[PDB]
Ligand binder design. Structure first.
Ligand SMILES: O=c1ccn([C@@H]2O[C@H](COP(=O)(O)OP(=O)(O)O)[C@@H](O)[C@H]2O)c(=O)[nH]1
Ligand SMILES: O=c1ccn([C@@H]2O[C@H](COP(=O)(O)OP(=O)(O)O)[C@@H](O)[C@H]2O)c(=O)[nH]1
Ligand SMILES: [Mn+2]
Ligand SMILES: [Mn+2]
Lengths: 392, 385
């Protein structure tokens, strides 16, 4: 069985909507490789949900939009910067999946950049951007991300529907059509009643369309709403993940969780952005939990480390808090480049913690043999091996 | 049933539900009141089922009206009927059995509370309060808290907490630190250099963990300890909590029902005759109250009922679909009647009943005494099956 690639985009403030949309998707579709573009979603949320996805034969990818090369609704531009599959389904998070999307996953795009449903049953112009079957390979080569940004830079003050207006203005005459049921814009109800489009309300709702899109500001999760099918959103919002997993498990669709308990706890205190080879070490040592502490604001280079499931980053901490982390750690990593904060060494000595360093990060005021080991920064494989020697 | 009260808004729903989960995980047969203005009824309907299966209940306390962050706890005696009640903040975690706290005799004290930050602060922390509600009610404490808050709210450093301390100085009993272990003080302690705070054992876990301050464990980043315990409960499924109790001979059937009738009314007025009474009397009926504009508080407060849906700023076509789906039109609105309703009622051959004082002055299967609305209750049940 092969994985089907799906991408959502949203901030932590929208977590209840993102999670509800994912729950509805996973309820009816297994083997999903889900990418989630975000800036501020907590790592703990990703860790747990990732286990669910894996147990259902899929995975969950934390795509952190942290850095200058990068919300609101514009994050879908950066899709080909994260997704490795040649085809992927983008979904808004103000929507609900009600059934098997196999036919949608398997649609052949040909030379079309994407496939999409029309806007509001044909009331609007062009396609609705909330459901996009995307030719990711083509998006990569045609440099679509830069083209959307550049075009949105012009004429964002000249368009009625933002990113959607931009997507239609770039892509017209080169997209495939999806049936309305794959992006059924039930959120248009207020609009339809406004413009007196009586026949919109004669469109059958039994059985439920495969994808329900609650467009507009009349969201069913608000205290009050006026559009139809409000009850469907709540049905999935209030659904335990256990219900979803139990349905798949009861049909023998069960895969082992790939999560593992940590075998070692490492700590470093930095005041600078550059912790030597930290990204590489994190990548190579998923079974080590790294704790990177600072007493001040942190640069994007360090904040972006949240994309790893095994790095905890503590900006704006204080000496008493660092001390407790040191006591709890197995090994100090002297990897920071600027002037050393001595008391960390004091904590290290006091609590009898081993400490290792790179050739270019060892203190100028310390003797070599004060470290358990000093390893070459241009061959960090050697420190990887060094770190693993502390485990058992 | 032990009475517990939380207070918070919909924006804080992730924290409220986590706190409740942690509470229910370790304590059964709880009557939970939740003071709020904007939490959706769907959330209440589902969580109420869980509380009932565990031998308790969930009460929606809607603070909707002129007489109404962080200051909702003043209104506790207006909603809570029990003589004693435990108020809890929503930025906290219950890690065990709270029986010794529930069973604490207050005597003549207005409340029991733990000291602020292990003694670092002044007076008590207001995030955990065992309240003598009978006394708060009889001595009109809510009014006094409001009045004291009118003055002095800008002379104080800790808001509602400072006011509660100011009113109840020398008239409260003490709780041990573990019933309000303010682990969220970690950043503060580290800031003011209170070194010995960090020597206090965290194992065994204190019965109540309180994440005070802006350093919340649910944020993307935080620096205080025990961050992982909050996430353990936030990510815990309700099925797990229910199974724990089911496994321990605690299991009751849900008191939920399905609606046997759908009724609808279109209104241009705040006054919909006897709608509060009808909703209360007919839980098996789902009432739909529609308006084309914003709605008065009298109508928005109907959200406290599990069987009334209110539709402010709706439109004729939207109303039409509701009317089509309805079994019976209730012409209960005072003042100007809107003809869209009569149009649809005619079109879709819908029955329509009224009170003797809400008939249109321009035209029913029945017209009932507005002074004995019980007759209408009997009549509404006559359309069912
Ligand atoms: O507060 C917000 C609002 C928007 N979104 C994201 O931006 C998308 C566009 O928002 P919306 O769906 O409301 O636009 P519409 O579908 O009405 O055109 C959403 O699906 C979310 O993924 C978000 O993450 N946080
Ligand atoms: O955005 C908010 C902030 C606060 N609260 C409520 O107000 C209480 C007091 O806030 P907090 O607990 O954060 O203050 P502290 O405990 O640090 O004094 C919380 O428990 C919540 O119940 C809320 O409902 N929404
Ligand atoms: Mn959308
Ligand atoms: Mn609190």
């Amino acid at each position: 069985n092969t994985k089907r690639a799906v991408v959502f985009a949203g901030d932590y403030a929208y977590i209840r909507q993102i999670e509800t949309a994912m729950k509805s998707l996973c309820r009816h579709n297994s083997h999903l490789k889900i990418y989630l573009l975000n800036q501020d979603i907590p790592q703990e949320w990703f860790s747990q949900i990732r286990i669910y996805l894996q147990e259902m034969g899929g995975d969950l990818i934390d795509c952190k939009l942290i850095g200058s090369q990068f919300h609101m609704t514009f994050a879908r531009y950066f899709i080909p910067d994260f997704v490795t599959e040649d085809k992927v389904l983008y979904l808004d998070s103000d929507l609900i999946v009600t059934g098997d999307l196999t036919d949608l996953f398997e649609l052949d795009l040909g030379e079309n950049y994407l496939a999409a449903a029309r806007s509001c049953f044909g009331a609007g112009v062009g396609f609705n951007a909330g459901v996009l079957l995307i030719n990711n390979k083509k998006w990569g080569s045609e440099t679509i991300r830069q083209k959307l940004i550049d075009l949105t830079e012009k004429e964002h003050e000249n368009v009625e529907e933002g990113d959607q207006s931009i997507l239609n203005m770039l892509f017209k005459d080169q997209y495939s059509s999806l049936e309305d049921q794959y992006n059924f814009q039930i959120g248009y109800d207020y609009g339809a009643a406004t413009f007196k489009h009586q026949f919109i309300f004669d469109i059958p709702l039994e059985p439920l369309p495969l994808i329900l899109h609650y467009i507009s500001q009349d969201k069913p999760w608000n205290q009050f709403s006026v559009g139809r099918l409000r009850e469907v959103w709540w049905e999935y919002s209030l659904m335990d993940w256990s219900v979803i997993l139990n349905e798949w498990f009861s049909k023998s669709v069960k895969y082992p969780s790939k999560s593992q308990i940590f075998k070692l706890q490492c700590v470093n205190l930095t005041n600078s952005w550059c912790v030597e080879k930290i990204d590489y070490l994190a990548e190579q040592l998923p079974e080590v939990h790294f704790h990177i502490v600072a007493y001040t604001n942190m640069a994007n280079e360090l904040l972006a480390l949240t994309r790893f499931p095994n790095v905890t980053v503590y900006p704006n901490s204080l000496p008493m808090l660092l001390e407790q982390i040191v006591i709890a750690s197995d090994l100090y990593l002297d990897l920071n480049h600027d002037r050393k904060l001595e008391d960390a060494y004091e904590f290290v000595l006091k609590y009898k913690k081993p400490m290792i360093a790179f050739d270019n990060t060892c203190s100028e005021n310390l003797s070599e043999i004060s470290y358990e080991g000093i390893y070459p920064s241009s061959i960090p494989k050697k420190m990887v091996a060094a770190i693993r020697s502390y485990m058992r």
